[PDB]
């Protein structure tokens, strides 16, 4: 079984978005009013599932083939998963989901008038390698209008979920594309108070990773809570 041999750097709750961020409407009624109760780390929190044995399909990470070819800007999204100490996070589960080129999601509840792409699903999963590297191949999603304010549009973005070594490191985030003018206008993006934190969410154009005459590439590194050994406990 898993064992309690690690401690994780305490989360900085002023870096992450706060629970109540009124401009993002839904958060009003979906935010606790009582303070979170701080508890010491134990095996319950310092352990988590290892996905090394899940049976991954051949195109689990290739959105171009996992669902013709989809219409849109062919891109590769690649990056590394490291911890706060700069240490790679090997054999970790990276899952992603996004809209199509037009901003339509392949989900029951999506009523946006832009059409579905017959050759596009929107889901990918990849286990990072020994160096903490992951990569996916997909199409760049389009902006998506949503019922927040009367004229609110989400910047193009890809939803990401990363497991890490324990339930303590587990994270759900969103990637944004370098230069998108909608970024600074999004109430969800703005849930994050430090402009410096926002920058961590922006995937950078990566010409070095692009496939000439084929597809472009974006670089997106993810930092998980720092893992240290217990001492003097």
């Amino acid at each position: 079984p898993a064992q309690d041999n690690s401690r994780f750097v305490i989360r900085d709750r002023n870096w992450h978005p706060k629970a109540l961020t009124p401009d993002y409407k839904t958060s009003i009624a979906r935010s606790p009013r009582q303070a979170l109760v701080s508890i010491p780390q134990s095996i319950s929190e310092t352990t988590g599932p290892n996905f090394s044995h899940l049976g991954f399909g051949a195109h689990d990470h290739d959105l171009l083939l996992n669902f013709g070819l989809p219409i849109g800007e062919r891109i590769i999204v690649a990056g590394r998963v490291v911890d706060q100490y700069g240490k790679p996070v090997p054999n970790t589960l990276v899952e992603m989901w996004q809209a199509n080129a037009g901003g339509r999601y392949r989900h029951k509840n999506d009523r946006y008038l832009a059409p579905l792409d017959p050759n596009f699903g929107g889901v990918g999963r990849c286990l990072t390698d020994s160096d903490g590297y992951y990569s996916f191949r997909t199409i760049k999603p389009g902006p998506y209008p949503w019922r927040n304010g009367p004229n609110d549009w989400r910047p193009a973005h890809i939803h990401f979920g990363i497991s890490g070594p324990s339930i303590a490191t587990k994270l759900i985030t969103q990637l944004y594309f370098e230069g998108d003018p909608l970024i600074p206008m999004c109430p969800i993006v703005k849930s994050i108070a430090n402009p410096e934190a926002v920058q961590q969410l922006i995937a950078k154009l990566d010409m070095n990773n692009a496939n000439p005459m084929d597809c472009l590439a974006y670089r997106f590194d993810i930092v998980l809570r720092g893992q240290r050994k217990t001492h003097f406990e």
């Binding site: 900085d12 978005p17 939803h159 994270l171 985030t173 849930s191």
Partner: protein, 200 residues
């Protein structure tokens, strides 16, 4: 002071979380292997239980787009981290609430006891992470059982909750679903009877 690299900021999971982490619910085709709500196979040691609940927002309305992840010890109080669909029991699982009634369910076994870092036993518990649209950063909670009153009273974690009335929000109520042992754990995100959520 020393500053490490900043952790990547959390973002809400959004309303379409299902297309990525709960394919069936999304109404999409699933892959060969998927992480779902069945932690134990019938031939798994321990007391087989069914967990079920609803999630309420601050207005008393059901959150029908919530997504939950669970982490628990097997019946022998051990965390089985090597996730595999062949396993009789997996310590990890996922569930979501129905767009209809809005109830999540999980098929598992009552977890054994585990000790905190100081060597003190904790009452049997299931660790839960809640994700949904409107939730900027996932909420952490624990599910304890009303039938473990003696253990619950001595839990070093439960005891950290200053007000005893607040501790009660963490206790699942034993019941039976189609004459099978079940425990109901409803989560109140905000307001009256608001569920305790932790930071760790």
């Amino acid at each position: 002071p020393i500053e490490l690299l900043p952790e990547t900021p959390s973002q809400t999971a959004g309303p379409y979380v299902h297309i990525g982490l709960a394919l069936e619910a999304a109404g999409n085709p699933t892959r060969d292997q998927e992480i779902w709500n069945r932690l134990a196979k019938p031939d798994a040691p321990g007391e087989h239980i069914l967990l079920l609940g609803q999630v309420y927002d601050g207005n008393g309305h059901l959150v029908r787009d919530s997504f939950l992840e669970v982490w628990q010890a097997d019946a022998n109080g051990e965390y089985q981290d090597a996730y595999n669909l062949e396993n009789a029991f997996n310590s990890f699982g996922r569930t979501a609430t129905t767009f209809d009634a809005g109830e999540w369910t999980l098929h598992t076994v009552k977890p054994g006891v585990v000790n905190n870092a100081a060597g003190v036993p904790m009452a049997p518990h299931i660790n839960i992470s809640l994700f949904a649209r409107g939730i900027n950063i996932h909420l952490h909670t624990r599910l304890y059982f009303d039938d473990e009153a003696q253990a619950n009273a001595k839990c070093p974690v439960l005891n950290l909750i200053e007000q005893p009335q607040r501790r009660e929000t963490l206790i699942a109520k034993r019941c039976e679903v189609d004459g099978k042992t079940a425990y109901r754990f409803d989560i109140r995100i905000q307001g009256e009877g608001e569920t305790v959520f932790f930071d760790f």
